[PDB]
Amino acid sequence: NPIVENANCPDINPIVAEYVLGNPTNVDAQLLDAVIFAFAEIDQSGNLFIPYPRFLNQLLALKGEKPSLKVIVAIGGWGAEGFSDAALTPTSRYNFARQVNQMINEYALDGIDIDWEYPGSSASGITSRPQDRENFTLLLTAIRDVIGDDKWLSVAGTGDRGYINSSAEIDKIAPIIDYFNLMSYDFTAGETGPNGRKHQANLFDSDLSLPGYSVDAMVRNLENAGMPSEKILLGIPFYGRLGATITRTYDELRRDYINKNGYEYRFDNTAQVPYLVKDGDFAMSYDDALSIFLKTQYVLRNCLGGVFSWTSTYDQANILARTMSIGINDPEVLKEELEGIYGQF
Amino acid sequence: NPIVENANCPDINPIVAEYVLGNPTNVDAQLLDAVIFAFAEIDQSGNLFIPYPRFLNQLLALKGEKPSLKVIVAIGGWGAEGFSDAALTPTSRYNFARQVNQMINEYALDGIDIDWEYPGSSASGITSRPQDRENFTLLLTAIRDVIGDDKWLSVAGTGDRGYINSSAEIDKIAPIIDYFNLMSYDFTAGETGPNGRKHQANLFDSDLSLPGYSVDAMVRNLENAGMPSEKILLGIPFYGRLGATITRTYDELRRDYINKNGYEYRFDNTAQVPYLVKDGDFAMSYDDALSIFLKTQYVLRNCLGGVFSWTSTYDQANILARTMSIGINDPEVLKEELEGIYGQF
């Protein structure tokens, strides 16, 4: 299975990056080719500022022990006003670019990321204009003209149809930027009720994703609209979402959602049985629904007389009993059940 | 994958059973072809008695709504003394058999299960004699002679080498009994320290099982010593074990070990992403180590520029970050990691 450097990408050295929103203390430079400080903002006058500069200086200091680390500033983010005005004229565009190059020289940044969410749309509550889409290309042109070719320029966007037709000229911005930071998450950020309880970052389509929205379709949409594959960065959320309403950090799922009293679920795929670890060590051996499906398979493939448990009294809700009975009597039904529980490669 | 009634077993109608130790209230007759009441015991005089008859009468009453349910009594169990004496002479053997047939007529049982643990061995603290092994066959012969062919007779045993050579004449008892109840569990019941922290019921061998002990090797050992496959019942534990010291009921793992605040882990194998359910409903969408391995695969197979997360601040321990960095830089190492976590069919 595992692909190590595809034999048609001898050139293409794919990079790892994180957006760093807030205190950067727990960033590990050793894992990352690049860090993207979030965020710089635009004030009433169209002037760039950093709300929390100490975080950016702290993050810049990681170049002490890893001088090859790339430090980028992202301007904007959801609800961040100013871009439609900045993009509108040759003057606003020259002024914005000049301030980008000033912030790059001032902080010795490796370059800049633009997070307009989104040109042509007032979904986030910001100003939009029909001309935003063509204007975006001229803004990026104005930034690239000033900062030069030797600095990172990137754009955060989606791969959905609306974005390709109404927000950006993918084929025009492609040769200007170094990367398109595909925000392949938050698929359910605008949904409540039934359509809220779907996947936010499904890699492919299924029953539990929004019709249309999938990572793969966003990568293909961007590729066919003229974005080279090598310039696409695939975005992964380190949070959980359930519709527009609720989000949780991985840290908050790690504490209130997944691992019971620190006991971690493990599987021996040789042995074909589940087990538990806690504090490095092997901690429990039992049978669950999968190892009972596999044992009941063995019964049927090997012409055995049947199966039995020790003992009903240990399984008062008849959860294992059901699995064991279905395993023998209707193994198709139990396989369907476990297709919706056990992660396959 | 899923086998439904192997095309070389048109005859062989494989059965589901449970041992019922203690209060039988939560037995579901609808799941089971047979229930095995545990236990009857042998007193100082060699006389059969039931320590808790009300449980057996309660269990017998399940034949009201399911008259085809088979109700069996198991005599013995771990540490249960008397069998070596009962097996020793033509008199003890006739006397034991007579009392078995009496208990079968008295309770209208469908038959009997013999749980001598184990002939020829004093491991459990019981009496053994070298002659136990040949004597076992004559005891079973004496029971079958009295109860007739129309009653269930079964023997609880293991498939290990010691049991085949020193406890039972598999080829001699085979034609006497209806079933051999393979106790394919407790592999670690006699181990502490390093060799304690292995699997108790591994279906095949691995790094985490005792050298020798596996369900498959016990089924093959019994088959090659002359036990027909159709008479073997495969035993599954509804408890967890860690060496000789600690055991937990499935109910006790369900409460103190596996499902955090009732939140259940589910996987969309189409979508290729994890999610959580609670109270019927879809409850959380996120990315874990598997969906990050799969996303980083997509990056490498599809010649993308790299990957990025939103945001390091949500993953303060760098657990997702590591997975994402290894996913791109050493995908072999991360696959090995997940082979020891994710249950494959």
Author numbering:
A (entry chain AAA), B (entry chain AAA): 368 to 712
Q: What's written in the study?
A:
Among the most interesting of the discovered proteins was CotE, an 81 kDa protein comprising an N-terminal domain homologous to 1-Cys peroxiredoxins, a central cysteine-rich interdomain region and a C-terminal domain with homology to family 18 glycosyl hydrolases (GH18). CotE is a bifunctional spore-coat protein with peroxiredoxin and chitinase domains that are implicated in colonization. Insertional mutagenesis showed that cotE is not essential for spore integrity; however, in animal models of CDI, when CotE is absent the capacity of spores to colonize the intestine and induce virulence is markedly reduced.
